[PDB]
A paper describes a structure:
Here, we describe the structure and function of AtAbf43C, an uncharacterized GH family 43 subfamily 26 (GH43_26) α-L-arabinofuranosidase (EC 3.2.1.55) from A. thermocellus. The predicted 580 amino acid protein consists of an N-terminal signal peptide (residues 1–19), a CBM42 domain (residues 29–160), a GH43 domain (residues 179–488), and a C-terminal dockerin I domain (residues 511–568). Taken together, we demonstrate through structural and functional characterization that AtAbf43C is an active arabinofuranosidase, specialized in degrading AOSs to arabinose in an exo manner.
In the β pocket, the arabinose molecule formed hydrogen bonds with three residues, Y73, H70, and D89. Similarly, the arabinose in the γ pocket contacted Y121, H118, and D136, as well as an additional residue N120.
Residue numbers in the entry: 7 to 474
The structure:
């Protein structure tokens, strides 16, 4: 069967053939360089054992030689067959994934190192992750196949935080997220939320090697505005990774996974300071920017602001603070409001935000305005006094937040996409614990028309929506 072999720790990268060089790469072009045929093993066709055949050079297989990997044509020798036969076993870093144990060296596994493929003994946790792969084959969810039922297995996407999911008018969801290295902007698409798991992501932009846009790269969001694609994202500098401002990329091409992305520069606000997590929405003919920013006069890391926009590339007028940390549940670790996300429903405009540190104490609050009010008047916005989404020990989910909102494909139900960890205790600076995973669940509605987010669902299969 035809398969891609995706790295466990670099999930944007795939085992591929590069003119007979065997490596892992992202943005594999042509895509067939990353496609393999898993066949019954040359040295043993029986249970477990496979051989990994090139789709372009049939009769050529991956074989180890002096513990390095080569793509070579089967020469009919027993040594070749043994060097090209591997038992598929449960993944060494995660038994739900796959590892490839050598037929003739059964203590050695296929692993990547400096992006090249080797056959090594596996000792460290690094080794285990380097030797674990996700097999994407014909039984995997096809991201190009439409389906009105929303059934996901959470986590949908491992090790992606701040998930942004945008349902476009072409019948695809588009997803951007923070990557654990905070060093690039990643895009994927799927007609179903579950297909986001198996979709091939593309690195559409990498940070500069010095200076501006050269520090932390955080929380990109892709939007379609006035016929063009925009990515709003936050970036520090190479000399201060945390001197973060808003930046914009633009793509006029219709497919953002194949089109050309252009830097447009900084999206400036009323003053220069720590600024991040921008989103935008339209209502009654006006477009707004909603974002997080430090005010030097307020002892919080950031507050929530709204402003009218003047096209996709600027705000106009004065920015208005509509949330600042006030309750103790906004100030665990440090005082912060960030990650705004907009949901329109029932004659209201809802803005969730995240608060407290990005460890298990992370949680969400809610702002509510009437959709006929002046959205630039702070008195139009009401903050809920308690968190509206938070850790839940009984479901094993910790620090949920920086969410986005989307819908089922038929638009009839609202779905929240957010990150959380499936353990509580973090060693070290939580910013560098990479295990916030992307997941989704239904948004329920109270009789009074306000959202009920419930509690973060436990890992596993979640039936979000079946149409009537
Ligand atoms: O790659 C390890 C061994 O080195 C080579 O000599 C053999 O073909 C292979 O089995
Ligand atoms: O191959 C990519 C990385 O390079 C080496 O640093 C590591 O072993 C591996 O994770
Ligand atoms: Mg966001």
């Amino acid at each position: 069967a035809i398969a891609k072999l995706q790295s466990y720790n670099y999930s944007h990268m795939y085992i591929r053939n590069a003119n007979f060089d065997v490596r892992i790469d992202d943005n594999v072009t042509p895509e067939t360089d990353a496609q393999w045929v898993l066949v019954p093993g040359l040295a043993n066709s029986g249970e477990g054992y496979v051989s990994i055949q090139s789709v372009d050079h049939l009769g050529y297989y991956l074989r180890h030689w002096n513990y390095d990997f080569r793509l070579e044509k089967n020469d009919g020798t027993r040594i070749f067959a043994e060097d090209a036969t591997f038992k598929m076993v449960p993944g060494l870093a995660d038994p739900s994934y796959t590892s490839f144990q050598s037929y003739n060296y059964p203590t050695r596994y296929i692993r990547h190192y400096n992006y090249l493929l080797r056959l090594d003994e596996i000792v460290t946790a690094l080794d285990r992750e380097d030797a674990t792969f996700r097999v994407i084959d014909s039984s995997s969810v096809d991201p190009d196949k439409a389906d009105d039922s929303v059934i996901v297995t959470n986590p949908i996407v491992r090790r992606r935080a701040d998930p942004w999911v945008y349902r476009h008018t072409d019948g695809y969801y588009y997803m951007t997220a923070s990557v654990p290295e905070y060093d690039r902007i990643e895009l994927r698409r799927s007609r179903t939320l579950q297909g986001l798991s198996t979709a091939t992501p593309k690195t559409i932009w990498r940070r500069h090697s010095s200076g501006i846009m050269g520090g932390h790269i955080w929380a990109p969001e892709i939007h379609f505005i006035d016929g063009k694609w925009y990515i709003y994202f936050s970036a520090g500098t190479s000399t201060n990774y945390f001197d973060i401002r808003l930046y914009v990329l633009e793509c006029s091409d219709s497919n953002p996974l194949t089109g050309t992305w252009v830097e447009k520069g900084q999206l400036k606000t009323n003053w220069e300071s720590f600024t991040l997590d921008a989103t935008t929405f339209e209502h009654n003919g006006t477009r707004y920017l909603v974002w997080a920013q430090k005010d030097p006069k307020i002892a919080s890391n950031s507050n929530i602001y709204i402003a009218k926009m003047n096209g996709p590339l600027a705000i106009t007028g004065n920015q208005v603070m509509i949330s600042t940390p006030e309750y103790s549940w906004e100030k665990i670790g440090y005082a912060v409001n960030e990650g705004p996300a907009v949901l329109k429903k029932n004659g209201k405009i809802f803005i969730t935000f995240s608060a407290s540190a990005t460890d298990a104490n992370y949680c969400m609050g809610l702002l509510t305005a009437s959709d006929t009010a002046n959205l630039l008047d702070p008195k139009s916005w009401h903050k809920s006094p308690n968190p509206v989404f938070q850790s839940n020990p009984s479901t094993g989910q910790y620090g949920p937040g920086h969410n986005s909102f989307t819908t089922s494909p038929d638009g009839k139900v609202d779905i929240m996409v957010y990150h959380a960890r499936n353990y509580r205790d973090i060693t070290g600076d939580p910013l560098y614990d990479p295990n916030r995973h992307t997941r989704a669940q239904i948004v329920n509605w109270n009789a009074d028309g306000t959202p009920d987010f419930g509690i973060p669902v436990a890992d596993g299969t979640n039936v979000i929506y079946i149409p009537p």
